[PDB]
Design a protein around this nucleic acid. Structure first.
Lengths: 94, 14, 77, 104, 51, 75, 93, 96, 79, 92
DNA sequence: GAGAATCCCGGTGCCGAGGCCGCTCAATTGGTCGTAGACAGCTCTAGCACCGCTTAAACGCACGTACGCGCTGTCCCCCGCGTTTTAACCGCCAAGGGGATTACTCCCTAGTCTCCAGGCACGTGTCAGATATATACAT
DNA sequence: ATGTATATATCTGACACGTGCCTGGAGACTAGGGAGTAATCCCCTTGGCGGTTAAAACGCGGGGGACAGCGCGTACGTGCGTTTAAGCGGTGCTAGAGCTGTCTACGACCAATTGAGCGGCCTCGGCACCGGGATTCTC
């Protein structure tokens, strides 16, 4: 059959990791699949325009860093830039 | 010939 | 240069040293504070008045005087 | 040996890199940008999965209905501004009745 | 190398897990390390080169 | 009779979901006309997406993109 | 006749649940006919029609919340078509 | 000679006829200077930037006062109150 | 402090170019409040715009692309 | 070279209104306008190229895009003028 | 019937809006090839349409009462206007701090061969609801 | 006379785990040009002068506009009789969605070229500004 692309198992077992005794339904998997590619194209576009506004021809951590510091209203960005910097330091550590 | 083959396959599966 | 940086750093924030070993440098221009070491580190053993014009033009050199010559002995600082 | 395990993250980093290559955003892509995308994505779904979890134990149900994420997303102003313009299928209306509209 | 508090230059006992700055006692963690602005960390740790 | 196909009690349930206590009798035709021009504006984009896709029928993702177009993004 | 208690229970009973209000077959021909305006005998889709159903329900509940908020502003519970015209004009159209 | 109001009608006719800015430049760049120095330290600015936010501010003021005018007309009142601008910002999605 | 720079006749001129006939005294502080939060949002865009490019000046392109970001863009200073 | 569109719409204006001028502030306004519509239709061309996985943009895709974002009779006149323009391209 | 307050007709620098030459990159032309759009052809999912039982939802008539609406007396708070006065704005002068760009450089990300296990797809067991017995006790 | 209480006993019903598989992400090798840095020139804007001047602050007379309050009628809410045509669900038919195969021609790439739009400079008349007379709502 067709090889459909969906991150439903990823959200399913971070749900299982943080909530070990909680269930879920297939409409929920479709609904935050719509969430995560909605924000994926939204912030992929944002950085794109921005970098092009900056006249840079690439996408490193800097453009997306200012995009996620600028885009969403608050709080989640304050934890998000810290946890993303911590993620790229465990990447460069490895 | 496709409909007869599909009917034969469905009858065999049933 | 401090004679022993391990022992001098554990007593330079006490009130018996900050009366003698604190230098206040004035810039040129035209709930108690006793138990808080922030007020000792920033404004020394004298109380801080934020409304005084000559007050906020002041350095306080208490730790750095023995901290900066220790970089030669320990370059990890 | 996977790069997501090397980054210590759970959301995949090769999948978003694949979607970034042929997604026609930039002709040159850095290494840390898909990791940063996976990090902010993991943070966003971690936050609303905590919200859906406390809505689920507020209603005392083992399965998160989308209505649970409606009153999880309408209980904070940050996602009331981030997802205020959005329209949700089978979302309902949060309980909100004006004091003047109530009798007596 | 001896650990030191990055706020005061004192002897550092505790390192904060959110932003990785060593500190000496509780109150510098209360009114300096916690409410510090983002981006202050990078030239805070530039002195010991931990950035 | 496509105008009066949609029932007045359905508009009553829509009003009670919106939080309307007292509603008049002349609101139904104007509400129906506004809904007709809204769905016509949506289905114009939807049918141009069907002629985009080399298909003679409608699907899911064309209506999805037509909802993402004007700023009432569907979820 | 008991006034207001049954209306309050009614308001709570469709502000608590998430039931569908618009019937599926009337709205079906409705949008089917709006479709004929562009494409006749347009083979249709069940996901397409519940997409239009939920979009129309969301737009209706947003417009009606706008209307009853600006009616409670106007010191009168009842609704006139000028309230709907005010909500449409102020909201952007 | 002495009127309740007719000078306001000539003033609104002249202001709808004209297109000149009615907001003084010095308090405007002073207030954006205070906001910028409240946010960060030692920022530089251009003149075309501050006439651009002058144009944005006068367009947003024109739109909001048209909104309050239509809301006051539908409220059967002539004098304007902050309830109308509060409902205008609530309806438009500026605050919620 | 410096928020009264848009004083009462300036808001009166904005009202007269906006179309409102009669003005009450409570309109002025509300209008300057929404002005000082709207310009705060634009400057909030502009600070991340300036710190992105490592550039410490704010041009007309900065505010024009920022107005493009909130969907209230303006012609005359680049597109 | 610093690209702009001054002499182009000056020639167009001399074609349509041979006794009418314009100012430089207005010239910048229409420069912002042409950049805005170009960026809008190019972003639309990219996204409805990306919807149906087609790696090549042809005339019919962005033709349907200008049927999309433009309203009715302007879209009719635009598609008629565009079709006659590409047929007087492909005739030569 | 008068009066501030408008519109309209005529002179006046001016300074900011049309040509023009110099010329430098940028649009134009030609050859080549490897891949993606288009067409033909193929298999089955699923949309359309109609029949018939069930029935809860919808129409329609009857009436009743609060609420929309019409009118009224009232403070009273904004509106026009005279009087200081206080900051805005124009003209200008020098600095110096920051924007552009030239110019080499090096590294790391584009591009390609290989290969294996990560995730997708398709089966089987395992705890939650539903009817039923049933008989003695309490209401 | 009847509910019921608390355990059966069957008994389905929706949900999570144990095998295939295939394909794309990761390891390894090659290249080249995109940020990286930094120096230098130049340009503009931030301070600082000072006069002078439209315009804001302040206080005072006055007039319609907003405030609650009271009565008149009627319109939507409530209810029961009577439809009705929505919902289930079932079956039969066939368009068309979707995948595969194959071809070939539009288009990316590269090298040379010519030409036309950017700009500094030059020149001059349209419009705002000013002065004074006709004209129109308003009291």
């Amino acid at each position: 059959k067709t090889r459909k692309e969906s991150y439903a198992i990823y959200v399913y077992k971070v749900l299982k990791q943080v909530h070990p005794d909680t269930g879920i339904s297939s409409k929920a998997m479709s609904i935050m699949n719509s969430f995560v590619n909605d924000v994926f194209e939204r912030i992929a576009g944002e950085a794109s325009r921005l970098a092009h506004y900056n006249k840079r021809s690439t996408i490193t951590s800097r453009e997306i860093q200012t995009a996620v510091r600028l885009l969403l209203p608050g709080e989640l960005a304050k934890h998000a830039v810290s946890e993303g910097t911590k993620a790229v330091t465990k990447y460069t550590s490895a | 010939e496709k409909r007869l083959e599909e009917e034969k396959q469905d009858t065999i599966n049933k | 240069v401090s004679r022993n940086y391990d022992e001098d750093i554990e007593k330079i924030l006490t009130l018996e040293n900050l009366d003698t070993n604190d230098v206040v440098v004035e810039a040129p221009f035209t709930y108690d504070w006793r138990n808080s070491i922030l007020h000792l580190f920033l404004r020394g053993p004298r109380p801080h008045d934020s409304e005084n014009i000559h007050e906020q033009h002041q350095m306080h050199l208490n730790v750095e005087r023995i901290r900066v010559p220790e970089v030669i002995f320990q370059p990890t600082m | 040996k996977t790069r997501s395990s090397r980054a210590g993250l759970q959301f995949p980093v090769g999948r978003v890199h694949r979607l970034l290559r042929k997604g026609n955003y930039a002709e040159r892509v850095g290494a840390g940008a898909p990791v940063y995308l996976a990090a902010v994505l993991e943070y966003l779904t971690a936050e609303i999965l905590e919200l859906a979890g406390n809505a689920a134990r507020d209603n005392k149900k083992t399965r998160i209905i989308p209505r649970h994420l409606q009153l999880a997303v309408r209980n904070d102003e940050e996602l009331n501004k981030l997802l205020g313009r959005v329209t949700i299928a089978q979302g309902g209306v949060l309980p909100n009745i004006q004091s003047v509209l109530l009798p007596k | 190398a001896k650990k030191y508090c990055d706020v005061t230059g004192l002897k550092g006992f505790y390192k904060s897990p959110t932003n990785n700055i060593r500190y000496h006692n509780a109150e510098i963690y209360q009114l300096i390390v916690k409410p510090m602005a983002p981006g202050v960390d990078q030239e805070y740790l530039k002195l010991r080169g931990a950035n | 009779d496509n105008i009066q196909g949609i029932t007045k009690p359905a508009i009553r349930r829509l009003a009670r979901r919106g939080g309307v206590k007292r509603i008049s009798g002349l609101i139904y035709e104007e509400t129906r006309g506004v809904l007709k021009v809204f769905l016509e504006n949506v289905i114009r984009d939807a049918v141009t997406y069907t002629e985009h896709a080399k298909r003679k029928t409608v699907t899911a993702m064309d209506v999805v993109y037509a909802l993402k177009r004007q700023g009432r993004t569907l979820y | 006749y008991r006034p207001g208690t049954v209306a309050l229970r009614e308001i709570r009973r469709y502000q608590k649940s998430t039931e569908l209000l618009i019937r599926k077959l009337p709205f079906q021909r409705l949008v089917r006919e709006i479709a004929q305006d562009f494409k006749t005998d347009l083979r249709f889709q069940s996901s397409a029609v519940m997409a239009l159903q939920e979009a129309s329900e969301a737009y209706l509940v947003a417009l009606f919340e706008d209307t009853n908020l600006a009616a409670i502003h106007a010191k009168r519970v009842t609704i006139m078509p000028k309230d709907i015209q005010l909500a449409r004009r102020i909201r952007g159209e």
